[PDB]
Design a protein around this ligand. Structure first.
Ligand SMILES: C[C@@H](C(=O)N1CCC[C@H](C(N)=O)C1)c1cccs1
Ligand SMILES: [Zn+2]
Length: 139
């Protein structure tokens, strides 16, 4: 579980979006596993606008934050699940680290702010759905 709250926007993993998120949909992308819904309260998370490839992520299955080196946002194949068929997920960044079902939503951050959220895992690898290109989240 986990979301990014910036301005009047809530950012979640699309496969974990609620009825309220869908009834207040702003934008969603199946290929990215992202969904943005509108909120009443004003969020204060800062979104990073950079090309940082090092940062720290929250791993709820360990109740710990871990420093990681991570790859550039790209199209990476993701195995079938009860949420999606086997496909290439776009804007995905991988790191060597622990992630298991339940860790989706954990925020990845660099010194500039929020980079993205945990979206894939397994095999000693963790996948993060990048949000740094969504410039509209700020305005
Ligand atoms: C099962 C596995 C995974 O990569 N999934 C399942 C949840 C949906 C993911 C996706 N982004 O399409 C794929 C996970 C381990 C840890 C977090 S999510
Ligand atoms: Zn950065």
């Amino acid at each position: 579980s986990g979301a990014i709250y910036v301005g009047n926007y809530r950012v979640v993993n699309r496969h974990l979006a609620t009825h309220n998120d869908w009834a207040n949909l702003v934008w969603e992308d199946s290929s990215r596993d992202l969904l943005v819904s509108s909120t009443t309260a004003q969020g204060c998370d800062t979104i990073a606008r950079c090309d940082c490839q090092t940062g720290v992520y929250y791993c709820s299955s360990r109740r710990k934050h871990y420093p990681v080196s991570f790859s550039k946002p790209s199209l990476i194949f993701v195995e079938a699940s009860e949420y999606y068929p086997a496909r290439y997920q776009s804007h995905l960044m991988l790191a060597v680290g622990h992630s298991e079902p339940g860790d989706c939503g954990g925020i990845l951050r660099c010194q500039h702010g929020v980079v993205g959220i945990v979206s894939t895992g397994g095999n000693g690898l963790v996948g993060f759905a990048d949000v740094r290109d969504l410039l509209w989240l700020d305005e």
